[PDB]
Amino acid sequence: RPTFYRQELNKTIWEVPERYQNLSPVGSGAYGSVCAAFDTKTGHRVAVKKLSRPFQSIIHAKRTYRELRLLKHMKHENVIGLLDVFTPARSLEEFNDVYLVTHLMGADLNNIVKCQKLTDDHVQFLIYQILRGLKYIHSADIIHRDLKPSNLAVNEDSELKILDFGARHTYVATRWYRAPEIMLNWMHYNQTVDIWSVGCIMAELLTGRTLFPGTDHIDQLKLILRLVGTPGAELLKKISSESARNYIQSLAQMPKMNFANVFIGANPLAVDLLEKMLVLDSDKRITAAQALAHAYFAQYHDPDDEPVADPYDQSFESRDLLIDEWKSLTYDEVISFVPPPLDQEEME
Ligand SMILES: Nc1nccc(-c2c(-c3ccc(F)cc3)ncn2C2CCNCC2)n1
Ligand SMILES: NS(=O)(=O)c1ccc(N2C(=O)CCC2=O)nc1
Ligand SMILES: NS(=O)(=O)c1ccc(N2C(=O)CCC2=O)nc1
Ligand SMILES: [Ca+2]
Ligand SMILES: [Ca+2]
Ligand SMILES: [Ca+2]
């Protein structure tokens, strides 16, 4: 058994194996907080997330299980996955803390390294990586639902990973990148909710400005309609609230803008891709796999290196179990974790 040590980080005691050294805080994550660390076994830099009160309630307990299951399944170069998972507990009866370990990424997309402005080739690379990660998670029936720059971890070489993907049950989050069907609680939607978000992110990389910086959900909707035009009646089918439908229907009709008049001087291929992503008709929205084939990414696209995921069993999501049952299932997942090899890639 490894020796653990205690260190106060973010005003609370972390208990970590001697393997991980020089911890220092690098911000909060979903339901936890994160430290950079040095892995003395491999000489690699890692990020360690300590979950916050993982078994305090039935909500925390199931979300702890959910996150550990999800991260144990994610094995893709543009998606956060696990190098390690640990607990100081020596038995289930002692088990009350969960730490997740992944490769250290320096920043998020808001902090991407650049020289004055991003070149189009660099924007291609950033968006390509998001879409490659989305193809993978979508193939396992996992949707992000809140994709945005702060949920894209980026390192010093602009390599990018999606994180905080895939909550059922209830900090002020930005809504500027959320798909309309999510922000307004429409009755149904598909995996292309995340493609809307990609469009919002890519637009901002091209212009340097937020695409839809609404002050509230009505202001944001108005900004959206000014770009994409007034929807048809069929879209009202998706909206439960009569007051919301009546309001939208009452708005003065707006024409769709030609995106070439909006993203001035952009690569025409970038404009065309944005036209395919920023669609209110989510059944006409391009999918991640389709976007990867778009000519905008021609210099990066490689079908042999755009894999899909193994099947992911989410049957647990429909189940209500007791707190100690989720805790025991989580403990099982900690104990059964098998670390990946340090080098899992080979030349093409
Ligand atoms: N610096 C860095 N590097 C990799 C990941 C993270 C990370 C994690 C996280 C997730 C799982 C895991 F096992 C370990 C860490 N959760 C939030 N973040 C950060 C993402 C960038 N903004 C600050 C929080 N942070
Ligand atoms: N990879 S490790 O060497 O840092 C490590 C960390 C923690 C642990 N551990 C647990 O998770 C439960 C009991 C225990 O000993 N084992 C190895
Ligand atoms: N906010 S804006 O309308 O002034 C604006 C700013 C920047 C841009 N743009 C460029 O300069 C290169 C590509 C692109 O889209 N377009 C519009
Ligand atoms: Ca290749
Ligand atoms: Ca190799
Ligand atoms: Ca090949």
Swiss-Prot record:
Its cofactor is Mg(2+). The modification Phosphotyrosine is found at residues 171, 312. Dual phosphorylation can also be mediated by TAB1-mediated autophosphorylation. TCR engagement in T-cells also leads to Tyr-312 phosphorylation by ZAP70. Dephosphorylated and inactivated by DUPS1, DUSP10 and DUSP16. PPM1D also mediates dephosphorylation and inactivation of MAPK14. Acetylated at Lys-49 and Lys-148 by KAT2B and EP300. Acetylation at Lys-49 increases the affinity for ATP and enhances kinase activity. Lys-49 and Lys-148 are deacetylated by HDAC3. It comes from the Eukaryota. It is found in: Cytoplasm; Nucleus. ATP binds at residues 26-34, 49. GO terms for molecular function: ATP binding; kinase activity; MAP kinase activity; mitogen-activated protein kinase p38 binding; NFAT protein binding; protein kinase activity; protein phosphatase binding; protein serine kinase activity. The keyword Transferase applies. Its EC number is 2.7.11.24. One of its GO terms (biological process) is osteoblast differentiation. The active site is at 164 (proton acceptor). Component of a signaling complex containing at least AKAP13, PKN1, MAPK14, ZAK and MAP2K3. Within this complex, AKAP13 interacts directly with PKN1, which in turn recruits MAPK14, MAP2K3 and ZAK. Binds to a kinase interaction motif within the protein tyrosine phosphatase, PTPRR. This interaction retains MAPK14 in the cytoplasm and prevents nuclear accumulation. Interacts with SPAG9 and GADD45A. Interacts with CDC25B, CDC25C, DUSP1, DUSP10, DUSP16, NP60, SUPT20H and TAB1. Interacts with casein kinase II subunits CSNK2A1 and CSNK2B. Interacts with PPM1D. Serine/threonine kinase which acts as an essential component of the MAP kinase signal transduction pathway. MAPK14 is one of the four p38 MAPKs which play an important role in the cascades of cellular responses evoked by extracellular stimuli such as pro-inflammatory cytokines or physical stress leading to direct activation of transcription factors. Accordingly, p38 MAPKs phosphorylate a broad range of proteins and it has been estimated that they may have approximately 200 to 300 substrates each. The TXY motif contains the threonine and tyrosine residues whose phosphorylation activates the MAP kinases. Belongs to the protein kinase superfamily. CMGC Ser/Thr protein kinase family. MAP kinase subfamily. This is Mitogen-activated protein kinase 14. It comes from Mus musculus. The gene is Mapk14.
